[PDB]
Amino acid sequence: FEESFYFYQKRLNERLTAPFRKDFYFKKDTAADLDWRIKLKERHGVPAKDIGRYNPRGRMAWNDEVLVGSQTSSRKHMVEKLLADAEMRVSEDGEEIPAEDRVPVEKPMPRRTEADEKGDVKRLDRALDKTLYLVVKKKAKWMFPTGVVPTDEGLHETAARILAESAGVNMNTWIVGRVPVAHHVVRPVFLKKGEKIFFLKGRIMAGQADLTDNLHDLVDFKWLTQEELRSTLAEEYFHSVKGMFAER
Amino acid sequence: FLLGIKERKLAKADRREEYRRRVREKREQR
Amino acid sequence: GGPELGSRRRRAALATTGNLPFEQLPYQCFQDARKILQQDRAAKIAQIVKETEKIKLIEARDASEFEGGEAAKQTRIKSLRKYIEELKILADINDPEVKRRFEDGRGDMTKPVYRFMAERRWRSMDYKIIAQRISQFHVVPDLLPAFDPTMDVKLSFRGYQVSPGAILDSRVTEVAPTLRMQVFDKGERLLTVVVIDSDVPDVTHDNFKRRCHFLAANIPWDPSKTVLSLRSVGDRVEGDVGKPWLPPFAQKGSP
Amino acid sequence: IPDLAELETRSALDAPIPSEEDKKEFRPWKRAADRKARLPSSRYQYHPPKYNRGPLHPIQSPPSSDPIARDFVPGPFNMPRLKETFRTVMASDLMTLAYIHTPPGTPKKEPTERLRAWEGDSPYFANRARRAPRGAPELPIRERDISFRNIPEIKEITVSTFVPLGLKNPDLLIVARAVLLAMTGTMPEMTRSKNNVVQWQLQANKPAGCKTTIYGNAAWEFMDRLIHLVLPRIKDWKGVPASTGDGSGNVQFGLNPEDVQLFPEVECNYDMYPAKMIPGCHIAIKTTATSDRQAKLLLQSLGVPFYSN
Amino acid sequence: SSVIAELIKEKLAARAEYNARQSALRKLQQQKM
Amino acid sequence: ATFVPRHRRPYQFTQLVQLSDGSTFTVRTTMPTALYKSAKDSRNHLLWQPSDKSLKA
Amino acid sequence: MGRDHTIHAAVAGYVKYYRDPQLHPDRQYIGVVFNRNDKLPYPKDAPRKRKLGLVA
Amino acid sequence: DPRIINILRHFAVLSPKRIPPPLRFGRNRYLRHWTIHRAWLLFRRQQREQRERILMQQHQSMSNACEELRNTEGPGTRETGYLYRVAMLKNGVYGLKSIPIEYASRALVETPGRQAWNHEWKR
RNA sequence: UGUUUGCAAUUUUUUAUAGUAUAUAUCAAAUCAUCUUUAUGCUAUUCAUAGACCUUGGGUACAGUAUAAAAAUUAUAUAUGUAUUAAUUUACAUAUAUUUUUUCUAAGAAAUUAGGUAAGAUUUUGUUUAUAGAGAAAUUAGAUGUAAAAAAAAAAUCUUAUGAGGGCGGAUCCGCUUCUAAUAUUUUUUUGUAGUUAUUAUUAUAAUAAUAAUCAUGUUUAUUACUUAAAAAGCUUAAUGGCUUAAUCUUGCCUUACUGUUUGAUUAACAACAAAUCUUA
Ligand SMILES: NC(=O)c1ccc[n+]([C@@H]2O[C@H](COP(=O)([O-])OP(=O)(O)OC[C@H]3O[C@@H](n4cnc5c(N)ncnc54)[C@H](O)[C@@H]3O)[C@@H](O)[C@H]2O)c1
Ligand SMILES: [K+]
Ligand SMILES: [K+]
Ligand SMILES: [K+]
Ligand SMILES: [Mg+2]
Ligand SMILES: [Mg+2]
Ligand SMILES: [Mg+2]
Ligand SMILES: [Mg+2]
């Protein structure tokens, strides 16, 4: 619906926006002007490349809507037309370049990388449209980097140290702040001492985790999504950290 | 005005068709 | 192709186009937007079933259980009942045909949806005028201490609509006028019509007195009725005529 | 259920989607050509008036959201990548970064009247006028905490240029009006002088500049190119001054005439404007923040470096 | 334009009729003035 | 009588902005160019990438 | 009220100096009542007290 | 002067008398836009109430943690509420280096770059 | 056929039919200059048609991923080449004005125009924060807060009523008078404060309790109501008073800045008269 709405609004702007004056961008009798007129002629006078063929004036201006199952509104079609137009169609001397001689433009990169296909959970470029979470196994139960809070340091100063001792210092990270975003309280057994874990949100900009020579008894790590966390973390350990999750 | 150009355009079409016809008869004769 | 089908454009469009419901027109943005409203109305209806069953649980609950007694039990169901009425309107407020049927005057006024748009339209231009007449003509506080109209009333003399507070000729205002009323709430009630002339000059006491020119009671009215002829109040329609229509008049010299 | 019975039975939102056989025969281009005649016009002919002549005038004007209205602007055309970033990654960080805890049973804070009143036993204190704003003559707005219900965001941006030399060379104002037209995508409004200075040859009440204003998505897109395509290209740029801010949440800063021609819209057609006529601008960012520090924190979230000066 | 021609003729007749009444009444006013 | 002003907006296009990092995104602009490649941007600047080492009396 | 802000009498009555905090909170008015024992400002909900002023 | 005429021509086409007129839709056409408009705003309502729900949930996760942290004792010989009082300090939160620019500068993109992520980054 | 081409959608009115006043259609006016050739041309391809690689031509295309099948089509004069005629007749093309489609040199870039009327706006001055060039002094953007699901009930103190034609003395006249209604006032006796979304706890996805948010079916540039001391700005000229709920400002239409006569006042204009001032019909 968003694509259909954008395309629907792009044509309503064609009927209300002032026409496009090529004189203000292209000088008459130049490589750019000739290149623009040739491509404009193929688009049937429409100076835009992402609204198909539609004339805001004339006797056929009322027929602006598109029927069901149309490709013109898709994002793939929009990007395809904009890329096929970025290629020069006229040499610097004003002569049209042959069809087979035109140099195509470098196409964009695919949204799904090789990691998505391979399914490597230790890669940070996987699920580029979702938020990944660093989960580490302890010699076994999966969890986040955790540790005891000494008497000299605080909550944020302790989280920074544990992260460097567990995941190494080769990560460009930033602790959001001192406020904890979630807590998991394990009541005591009247015996065993309870635990009041306080989690601090963190964000990684670049780098990769390193478990070599870690101080804690850590074995493996993996960057999981919000959907894969509930399948890995325990029920009680997940119900307490799910409130910190985001939309994506 | 619009239909005026229409009628005057169709009128010129007949004249062009009369020229196309008559000139064709000469080409065949030659 | 007769007038029973609509205007010329419809009878003309209904002869050169294909027979297909308006909601089934194959348009991309129109069918992607209709699906958003479709699966939404299904959620509103799923909520009405959830809230209706919640009142049963509260209804079948001893008032003693509630810390506030029976007083706190009704204020909770009241908020629930009012919440359902809003869901019955939001389920059809986005329907494109409910708007078409209402604008064409073919809307069923017994349903909350049409009575909602009917009042929303009346409160846009007609209420602002009648509200002004009550103030500029000093109908308040003269006749009543305070008055806020809640229904529409359009009176026409001999088939001619009269503007609110318009000077009419003594000959035009000689027969009982036809009241084109319209109520916006459900149910059937008995109405009482009164026509009062509040400017009769009393020269003996140097003041004005009010005179009733018409009075009728026990007139059943529902949101489906629109026209009421004050001529036949006890003959055709049910009602008790307290005073027949008196031709309005004004002596020369008085305002 | 009686409630469901009160709903529209002839629901159009519950009809099945169109079919392929009926869609293949739906050819609007063929209907007009096949008709071979002009369809009679409808009897409903109401057009929005050119002037609003009151709330009780017979002919009324429709809202701006009505397509036929004279003020209708086509809706959004795309989702700016900057507004999607903020609402996705940064909206929660600002809330988590700046956050103060309130006990569960904390009583609501009642605001104090900033215009004091005289209270006492003196018979004169009764009808005394309210005291003046203590300190400054105008009351400053109070800061609102950054909670989950108040997330500072960008609202609009005003790009204004002042060309005093346009009073002598009228061609300097025409070029300035065209630069801001392409840079922002709107029709700038000409501005006039308000003071006279014989030393500067400034005359009041004469056109000496222009201005624009972009709202909604148009503002996020301007910041998208400004921060990621214009400012990085300025030579020896230190950042936005740390002193910018009107104490109410609006950040202001200007660009040199050599930095305005770096805009992708101006450099593409640079040879169309006369030489030495591309002016600077005073870019004013208006945000929903309620303080001077909340604005800097908002711009810091969008990748705007601030240099101390 | 099979059945629409009849409706068009009805529209044309409605217009040609008014144009006749307007010209038939405008002439009466010019005689009274 | 309050005048109802109309919007005077110039023609706008949909442009693909390819950053120096290779990433692309669509934007709304007035220039007719379809693809705008940026050789210098935040992804290629030291003020925005202080930790980046490649750009780095 | 006159052109020069002079307040005249529009009917035959008795002058009254009063304050109507309902109409305007910080204004003082002058009125004319038909009965000397009337008290202005009249309550907004009471009927208008008017005289015919006509002879038959 | 010739170049300036190219500018005046650009403003002339934007004159109120030159710009296109207000739209003129029929009923079936007007109703079709009425649903597209009635649905788009509803779509925004769903995206808003969803976006505002996550903000309320994330906020309630902190209130529960901070509230609990305010009652904890320790670590060691530390009075109750110490970590809470230290967790509410805003030292450098509103400074110049508050948020790292490397994170804020990286915005979303329709498609990734030649190198989506940099795993070879070294301190 | 004015009005956007798929279909009863604004207000009033005309006419006609049914109908016993209403209903439907139709017409006119108001609101608005939306631009309209159903293809006659273009485009692509092919087939003829010239010979040192030309003009003019006939076909083909089958259109929702809309299409070659209109992204904008005029007239006229001169003159040339091809070509044609009884002819500067016709067709074609250029040579270049000249006109129409107003669609291409920004009036929504320009005046401080001051009265009548209607609508809309409501601190504009100064002070102050910030802002390429820009400084003591140039432009621009800002400078209060609250509310917007919703109340219900008991008594009392007045005041009002062209309320009950109240009662009693002299229907609507007047002083005493109970009752009822309404506004206001008590800090008053309280009762209720939900629903929705989400969190936490208990209980068996639901229920209950607590906590938090909650104007929102609406282009978030939301909107609406209320509030924001005083001075200052503005209101034809000094000074004083006044106006912000208009006497200011903006815009539309206008020119009552009208003709004759006339009322009551300025505690009987100026401590007389006269020339005056305001107001009424
Ligand atoms: N708008 C309302 O009706 C409404 C209702 C309740 C509360 N609020 C409050 O007002 C503020 C803003 O409301 P909002 O969140 O609904 O505004 P919004 O962000 O959804 O709309 C702002 C602008 O963004 C555009 N937009 C919205 N979604 C888009 C998309 N997917 N792609 C491209 N453009 C898009 C809109 O059309 C509009 O131009 C918030 O504080 C909100 O809680 C708004
Ligand atoms: K939204
Ligand atoms: K003030
Ligand atoms: K005026
Ligand atoms: Mg000022
Ligand atoms: Mg300065
Ligand atoms: Mg004036
Ligand atoms: Mg005297």
PDB file of C-alpha atoms in Angstrom, chain C residues 193 195 211-217 230 233 240-246:
ATOM      1  CA  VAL C 193     -45.261  21.539  18.728  1.00  0.00           C
ATOM      2  CA  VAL C 195     -46.111  28.324  17.837  1.00  0.00           C
ATOM      3  CA  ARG C 211     -50.071  34.558  22.053  1.00  0.00           C
ATOM      4  CA  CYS C 212     -50.220  30.915  20.969  1.00  0.00           C
ATOM      5  CA  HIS C 213     -51.063  30.429  17.289  1.00  0.00           C
ATOM      6  CA  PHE C 214     -50.839  26.612  17.296  1.00  0.00           C
ATOM      7  CA  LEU C 215     -50.505  23.784  19.804  1.00  0.00           C
ATOM      8  CA  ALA C 216     -50.396  20.011  19.381  1.00  0.00           C
ATOM      9  CA  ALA C 217     -49.137  17.103  21.470  1.00  0.00           C
ATOM     10  CA  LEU C 230     -49.476  20.597  10.686  1.00  0.00           C
ATOM     11  CA  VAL C 233     -52.526  16.382  13.018  1.00  0.00           C
ATOM     12  CA  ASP C 240     -54.290  15.919  19.972  1.00  0.00           C
ATOM     13  CA  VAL C 241     -54.827  19.409  18.549  1.00  0.00           C
ATOM     14  CA  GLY C 242     -55.019  21.814  21.474  1.00  0.00           C
ATOM     15  CA  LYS C 243     -55.414  24.860  19.226  1.00  0.00           C
ATOM     16  CA  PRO C 244     -55.781  24.956  15.417  1.00  0.00           C
ATOM     17  CA  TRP C 245     -53.521  27.104  13.279  1.00  0.00           C
ATOM     18  CA  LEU C 246     -54.212  30.812  13.748  1.00  0.00           C
TER      19      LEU C 246
END
